[PDB]
Design a protein around this ligand. Sequence first.
Ligand SMILES: NC(=O)c1ccc[n+]([C@@H]2O[C@H](COP(=O)([O-])OP(=O)(O)OC[C@H]3O[C@@H](n4cnc5c(N)ncnc54)[C@H](OP(=O)(O)O)[C@@H]3O)[C@@H](O)[C@H]2O)c1
Ligand SMILES: NC(=O)c1ccc[n+]([C@@H]2O[C@H](COP(=O)([O-])OP(=O)(O)OC[C@H]3O[C@@H](n4cnc5c(N)ncnc54)[C@H](OP(=O)(O)O)[C@@H]3O)[C@@H](O)[C@H]2O)c1
Ligand code: NA
Lengths: 348, 349
Amino acid sequence: PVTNGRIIFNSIPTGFPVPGETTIYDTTETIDLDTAPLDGGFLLKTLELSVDPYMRGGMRAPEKKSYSAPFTLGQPLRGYGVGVVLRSENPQVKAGDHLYGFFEHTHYSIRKDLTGLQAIENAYNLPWSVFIGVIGMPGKTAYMAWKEYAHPKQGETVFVSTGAGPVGSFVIQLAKADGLKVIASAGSEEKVQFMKEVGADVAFNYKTTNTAEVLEKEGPIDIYWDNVGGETLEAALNAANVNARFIECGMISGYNSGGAPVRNIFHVIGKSITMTGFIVSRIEPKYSAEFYKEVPAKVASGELKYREHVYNGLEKLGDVILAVQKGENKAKAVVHVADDLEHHHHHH
Amino acid sequence: APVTNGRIIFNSIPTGFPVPGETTIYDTTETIDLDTAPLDGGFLLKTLELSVDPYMRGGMRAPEKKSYSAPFTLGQPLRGYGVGVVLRSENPQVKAGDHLYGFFEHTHYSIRKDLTGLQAIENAYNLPWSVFIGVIGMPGKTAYMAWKEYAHPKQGETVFVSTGAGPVGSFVIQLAKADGLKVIASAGSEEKVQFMKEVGADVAFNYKTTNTAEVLEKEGPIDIYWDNVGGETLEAALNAANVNARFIECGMISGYNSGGAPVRNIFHVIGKSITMTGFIVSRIEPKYSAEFYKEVPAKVASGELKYREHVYNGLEKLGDVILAVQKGENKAKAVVHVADDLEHHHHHH
Ligand SMILES: NC(=O)c1ccc[n+]([C@@H]2O[C@H](COP(=O)([O-])OP(=O)(O)OC[C@H]3O[C@@H](n4cnc5c(N)ncnc54)[C@H](OP(=O)(O)O)[C@@H]3O)[C@@H](O)[C@H]2O)c1
Ligand SMILES: NC(=O)c1ccc[n+]([C@@H]2O[C@H](COP(=O)([O-])OP(=O)(O)OC[C@H]3O[C@@H](n4cnc5c(N)ncnc54)[C@H](OP(=O)(O)O)[C@@H]3O)[C@@H](O)[C@H]2O)c1
Ligand code: NA
């Protein structure tokens, strides 16, 4: 029998998550990989777990019942991941199958069927982590909301906040393929270099650069991709062109402080702005087939560039959640939970 | 026999609300002889009705921060929408008695070289001339055109209309009911609540004596929000919004006299997948202008489209009417009656 560790949602944070208090790591549960009773289901080994900015918002008290369900106190966290089937008594599932979907933040789970899971099409033998990033929900977010809401015209100017993340860096590349001038900002020099590498025309570190002054010089802006909200949205509103489109994807500047105010929303009227918020899952059905047919080949060839920040060990996941909220992840945050016994064979 | 050609002059930039007598002054030093004034191929135009609109506060600022539109010039007459009648014309296309709609300086008389900025009024139903600066004027166009452009209504949805008793909001209420929507609407007085009910609001309340969030909780969620107010009312609508709501951003009067009104819960735009569209009526008007003038007059004449107005008599009051509109003290669409029209006048005892 081996350890089946779990990352537990333990207490509601007031500001930023507190690793070891907000989330705890539990190693008291075990599983026998050969003996675990499957009951016609299958044994699924967690390989890669995504850590995403939205996880902070699920750390709240239980309130009525809405579409947005908070994490349950005392239960494992959960989110997108990749796993492999070790042992199956279910005819739809074969040992060695790699599956994508929501995973509890544990080493192993026993699933009765494929509800919530999809077989992964990996024709290019890409690292499994790409299916929770550029070929996962963050890539879908950029791909689908851009096509749905940007209405880009060649020669217009777009401002992308958090341009070095998995969403923003995808958006930059879609915007350049449409012939737009791209302004993008991130929180470190290494992220600025990546933004230039994926083709940002103006790439800057918002911690060492006056954002409003850059937008004044390089704008006005026809499209704002909002990942930050707050003062950065205010800056975009001040620099907006008439008939600008504001794609409201995230507002991370308020995730750990109860939201961030906007004081100049009147520009939406004065400048005839269309500001559209979206949740990627709501618009994905229209685009999922096209996304999975188009994106893997471009990741394999380098047409679509990506970066990731891999953290090794389920026990780090709580710290990784804080790292993302604090902007300390260098790129898309991946918790590598376990290896797959193929490609990475352990030997001395 | 020269008569006073009075003028409302923009005199100083206000800090909060306009101050009649300081922000605006009434100047009676100019005279005009209606019979002898040189027209020089132009025509003499007599001001009949002037609109006072909420946006006028926004033009009362320094000329440097010139933003979307043009600010009023210090020392010059104010201006805005109005109706006037031609008294005397040396212009072959313009005839005495012609009634014209467009931008008017806030004066009793003007000499125009041509019809620039003006359009003949089609008044087949002999409606009061003031309807062409309200329900059949820019405020009615605002409701008519933005609703058709942005509401994408579906039968049985719920709309919340702020400032529901004004010329914009009460027009919106009627469009929404015609589309089969449930309508919630709020205004600032009991008399305005009665009017909102008269034009068919299903839920009509006075937001000053009734908590908006409580009404929206009981009567929502809301699929469409028509924003005339911004600020805490926009915040309340965001919290009560349905998934895929449409927020039509028309005005935000709660911040016109206080440097804007903040919004603290704009994150609801993401969580509830809201489409929030701001607009300026003059930008979308060309697309709808012909259909508007073809459809609306007959409905005003028949009572199908209902309207109210609050008439103030006398050009010298206009600055006070501007403050009144900002303070919510106008009972309905604010109209300054400048002069009567002599179309059917015959002097006799
Ligand atoms: N369906 C949706 O609407 C949807 C879907 C996916 C993602 N999102 C949102 O997209 C945004 C980015 O997602 P992602 O997967 O690409 O995450 P990410 O870029 O890998 O991580 C979040 C990044 O946000 C930056 N950040 C943290 N605090 C900040 C602050 N106060 N001010 C400015 N930047 C801050 C940090 O990068 P810097 O170096 O730039 O500071 C951090 O690395 C998030 O806001 C997410 O909530 C929305
Ligand atoms: N192109 C455009 O975007 C466009 C065009 C025309 C008009 N508008 C806007 O539409 C709105 C209504 O225009 P209207 O012609 O129909 O004017 P209106 O209703 O005749 O007059 C303004 C009204 O706003 C209400 N009000 C004033 N201060 C308020 C405050 N702090 N909080 C809440 N309500 C307040 C008042 O009525 P109650 O408080 O009693 O309800 C006041 O009567 C304005 O915001 C205007 O700027 C926009
Ligand atoms: Na950072």
